[PDB]
Amino acid sequence: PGIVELPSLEDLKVQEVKVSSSVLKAAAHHYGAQCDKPNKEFMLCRWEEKDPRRCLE
Amino acid sequence: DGPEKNYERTMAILQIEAEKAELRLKELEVRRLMRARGDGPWFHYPTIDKELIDHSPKATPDN
Technique used to solve these coordinates = cryo-EM
Q: Are B62 and A51 in contact (CB under 8 A)?
A: yes
SS3 B26: helix
Q: Chains A and B: how many Cβ contacts under 8 Å?
A: 9
Q: How far is CA B34 from CA A50, B22, B23, B45, in A?
A: 40, 18, 16, 12
Please check whether residue B60 touches A, CB under 8 A: no
Please check whether residue B62 touches A, CB under 8 A: yes
Q: How far apart are CA A12 and CA A55, in angstroms?
A: 11
| Documented resolution in Å | 2.3
Q: Which of A45, A50, A54, A56 to substitute to test the interface with B, most B CBs within 10 Å? A: A50
Q: Report CA Rg, chain A.
A: 15
Instruction: Give ∠ CA B22-B25-B27 in degrees, rounded to 5.
Output: 110
Strands (DSSP E) contained in B1-63 are none
